[PDB]
Assembly symmetry: D2
Homo-oligomer: 402 residues x 4
């Protein structure tokens, strides 16, 4: 009994959980985070009311998702375990934070979610909830015996049918999906056998690289403070100079050319290896563009220190520690390194690949004249000394193990 804010999506799990928490005594507040997925939110709201929700909040959270979450992730220049661009992992603290906000506003003692007992997301939601509101209580049905021993997915379907929970007819895929503005992830079902290949009908956000356009899209991406501020199509003249709008245009450009597809096995914070395929179109373009622009504008030695911090950032976000003193310090250090990260990157998007074509920047650390056929401000005799003393170690070390 009391009021619970449930992170609700409209699917079987969270439809059932709504009804279940209601059967258990709770007044349920259905909370629909609109984060760039393809939902008919109004109908999901109607469905939630029919199901017995006391209240429905649809929060459009896309712009702040781009600007407060995706932007620092690009600044980081880092990939979880050298492959994962963190699409879902970034979204959870964005979702959880608004959920806590709705709960404290409503005077609700409990929050709730439909994440499974073997996942990362359970951790991410709940670490942010406790971090931001130490006194909130969580109900995670998939970790409740009374719940998880009863619905041992076809047991859940039956539960739906018995309580008149509607099942869309659209029909089910033998995997689960997570979709937001940044990516789409597909993970259970048939994909659990890491020997088995994605069927072609799996890929919903990117074109098949064999069907993709024959002409590339050539874009110019402008950065300031490590994040994109402008996208212009060099050919057709299209321009976007606001965050969400440029990001979606990059999704639409990259998806059109089949860009952003990975197939990976990853290691889950609880310690299970999991097999996932991902579609991160815009994220893939920006990952590469940003690397090129920070490398052009950053000191060599700042960069290696900064990249260690990013690596740390990637692991903290993946495991669910966005709202922590350590990720806050790390985000601050990463932000600081990006002060001069600005300029323009020319890129080409074609057949499932992004290509860097050129770059320029008024804050460039590049010196065309110095690296030159012409001399210039350099003494070749210096280098001789530099080599010769770097070798002293090296010649010691040989003579003395000889």
């Amino acid at each position: 009994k009391g009021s619970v804010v449930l992170a609700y999506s409209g699917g079987l799990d969270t439809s059932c959980i709504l009804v279940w928490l209601k059967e258990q005594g709770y007044d349920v507040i259905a909370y629909l985070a609109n984060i760039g997925q393809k939902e008919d939110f109004e109908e999901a709201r109607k469905k939630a009311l029919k199901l017995g929700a006391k209240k429905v909040f649809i929060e459009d959270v896309s712009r702040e998702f781009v600007e407060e979450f995706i932007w620092p992730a690009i600044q980081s220049s880092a990939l979880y375990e050298d492959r994962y661009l963190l699409g879902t992992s970034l979204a959870r603290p964005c979702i959880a934070r608004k959920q806590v906000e709705i709960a404290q506003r409503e005077g609700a003692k409990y929050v709730s979610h439909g994440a499974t007992g073997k996942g990362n997301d359970q951790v991410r939601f709940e670490l942010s909830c406790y971090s931001l509101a130490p006194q909130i209580k969580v109900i995670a049905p998939w970790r409740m015996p009374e719940f998880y021993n009863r619905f041992k997915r076809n047991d859940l379907m039956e539960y739906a049918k018995q309580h008149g929970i509607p099942i869309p007819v659209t029909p089910k895929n033998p995997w689960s999906m997570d979709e937001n503005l940044m990516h789409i992830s597909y993970e259970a079902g048939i994909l659990e056998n890491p020997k088995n290949q994605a069927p072609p009908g799996l890929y919903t956000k990117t074109q098949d690289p064999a069907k993709a356009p024959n002409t590339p899209d050539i874009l110019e991406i402008e950065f300031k403070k490590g994040v994109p501020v402008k996208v212009t199509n060099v050919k057709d003249g299209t321009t976007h100079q606001t965050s969400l709008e440029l990001f979606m245009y990059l999704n639409e450009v990259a998806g059109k050319h089949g860009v952003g597809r990975i197939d990976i096995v990853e290691n889950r914070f609880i310690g299970m290896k999991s097999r996932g395929i991902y579609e991160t179109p815009a994220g893939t373009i920006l990952y590469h563009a940003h690397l090129d622009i920070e490398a052009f504008t950053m000191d060599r030695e700042v960069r290696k220190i900064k990249q260690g911090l990013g690596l740390k950032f990637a692991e903290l976000v993946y495991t669910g520690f966005w709202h922590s003193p350590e990720c806050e310090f790390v985000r601050h250090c990463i932000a600081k390194s990006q002060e001069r990260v600005e300029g323009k990157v020319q890129v080409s998007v074609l057949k499932g690949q992004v290509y860097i074509l050129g770059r320029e920047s008024p804050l460039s650390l590049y010196n065309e004249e110095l690296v030159s056929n012409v001399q210039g401000d350099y003494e070749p005799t210096d280098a001789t000394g530099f080599i010769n003393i770097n070798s002293l170690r090296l010649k010691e070390y040989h003579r003395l193990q000889s």
Copy 2:
């Protein structure tokens, strides 16, 4: 005076240097490292004799280049500054080591090279020479005033003409190339303006992704101890189970599909930023395949420690410290992590991109049953404790800065 072993390639710089060291008193031993480039070595030998070389050594160094250099680089899973696969950087210690070997055999007091005063390669050659033979002497003409002030590239052409040094007619490109078995690099001339895009005729080793085959090549790559031992084409049945032969077939497959192209600005050991484009076809396939197979067969926590070592490996190789106690220790630690890195990766090569399709391994750390819709060996109640104590910090830290 005395005998000098010159790392000779047959191009303008090292043709001129041969003649110059000869004019200076030295007996010149011309040393042609055959490392998978496209030279007519026999003619380069003839050219070296005509030029006044006392002696010519052509060393076919390809197999040991793959097995002793490229193999540990793949084990490392690392990229210099997140982009560079180290093609040229790996080759130098292979070349320098054989040069020192030829010099000590011949009783030659000096070795020599045609690397410029602003490069990485000068460092790599000479650090390995001193490391392996502390008493050898180096002649690096590009760092000698008597030499570099006189040939302030058209001054070098004149020198050639005046000493009857032949100039191929093939004509010059407004950039310099470095080619070996692993890659091709292009760097000076027009490419020095990082705003300027590679002209299409630049790309000699990879197909244009717009001209590349419409059907992919699907390959199965087998690893053992972190390095490829087998490549089989799933369609046409082609099989290679020896190191050099599988590597070249992967070059030929990846080059055919336009795979392995980068355009980057990098930071040079002497501290100048430089602009380079690279073609690393096989290297690009193996980079991705190996990542997938180590991730499937490696403990999560071994992996992050191991990846720090790889990062260290990448920097040590780039800067020229292959032959050092620190790179030796690092290579040893990296090798040790790879003991269980084995299995089979299914990959697709199409339109300038490599795709992972699936993987399997008898040393897999994957548990299909555990990660599953079915229960299994897991207690969902555990995770609740795991979350709740990970939050204790986190809730402390909020209350106490409140």
Copy 3:
């Protein structure tokens, strides 16, 4: 019901737990790890039998504790959070491993321990048990509601009195102690207020530095492969050339001079900060001696890579991950670095401090002649080049943010 191997010490907690597990249905095997503490093990055995133990194992585990645990810890050159020498943290995997060994021999389905619910040791025992024997079951009464809600320390005393559990008369100190061969730790009770100073009667293993001898003890410590193999007193001639015997002599020497005292606040694996004072006499001498000898015999760059691994080692041991693939890999890498770590360190032990006096080694990387008033094998002109190119960055970076 069934048989349980209880890590038993003879104190109130584990005396009560013995009786409690017996009341609960279990046959209790009392397991006394002799690890260099000051117990009357035979009487603790008698006490355990009187209490209803089916069986008593006293295992003298000291020599293997020194040689398999303390030795790799010294090789590591690392301190948990720059202060803690890990005395108790090292002991647990030594104790747990023998416990699992006794349990599997006996055909016992369960193991048990008296560690509290807020500690590190619960984690260390149980992570090693599961790691070494995935199928064993743990009973940790302090985490059982039926147990911990009933004995909310005076409730435990009453339980003792009501079951005729003997209480020594020796009387209690308002803190808890953990003692082994390596150290003694004191932690709860009055010490929980980190503002409060240790009372003088707290310190049982080290002399008060104000009462300590006026003449120092000067010792020569010999290392091989990073671990001490010989201790000789320079004055009185005492010599120990076996592991356990030299270690105890160093405890006895350091304790005599008041060496090895710390007072720290540390952060506990579950995330609570805790206040602890420690006495690690021999450990403190060896920490300093070994640092001096590895620094004399190790390459500069091997050292920083190695020290990162040690840091990792310290955290893995503190948190309870000795028996893990990551600590195993790290111990292996650390061992490998120590191959040349050998020689002789002259040290002085006086008034709560250790002093390094000198050192020597046939595997020294020191060059007296080179570092010299005399020239020698060096070119001062080299250094000029080395400085000048290290500055190129540095001068770039100024001009280009000017």
Copy 4:
């Protein structure tokens, strides 16, 4: 010819260099950095004028040395190679910066110093000079053939005698000293044999721990933002609440009790190992006090990230890169971590050792109640889940290499 600012100390080397640069055509500006050493600066000024200096600048640089250099070094909590507190290494950028400032004011084209060709200090002076003023020119006589081949220390003495350069009568020690406010270092001569022990008359700044007071000094040190702001003697009531004054009082307290003595072999930026003994009295107290106060007030995970940065700081300072973008970024990150580092540490100074006695802070992350015999805000059942899922890896990893 032209004007040169020489970092002058008044000793044989820099007295001779003054006269030599004058003989070579230059107008010499003698620059005496007063950095807390024991010079009679007025007489050194008189000596410099007699010697032919056009000008003499005595700069009292002590307060800014403490506040801008030593303070960030304490914030760092780090030791070069786990032993060296960086006394001399910190001073050089302080000295070099004022030298560049004097040179640019005077319109002097050149700066100069008497550091040897095999040292660290040559690097530190000159990297800061170039970093701060890319166009200045350096004269480093010890790297000039015309100079260093002529004064092959008794050749320098003769040079003095022949030019009427006064030699103090005080007589020479068979080692060189470097002294400032932070420490004293002794290094060449007899100490070059790392087997040889410091003679007792070597130690000028610290009492012999055998002669040191029988009663300790108990001090309370207050920190704010990671740096000491107050020192009060608990017994005698002495109080210092300004930076330089508290630092000197801590030198005077620690020196009185024999605190701050080390004997080490270190590895020099050019790659030679060197043997040095150091006396860092106040630095030693503050190193330990600050560690205790940051550990009490810092998040566990902020701390390990922060300590990596400090480690980086220590190496950047030792090698001479204070004035670099990477040390600037690192100092900024380190400063940021210290925002909450504040409170009071009770310490005891006795017989060559410092002891932590207690600590307190209004920004404490310590929770007496939580870590407690009393329950409190904790669920012991949580920890069971935390252990059990930390073991899942661990049990996997065993079954799958079984």
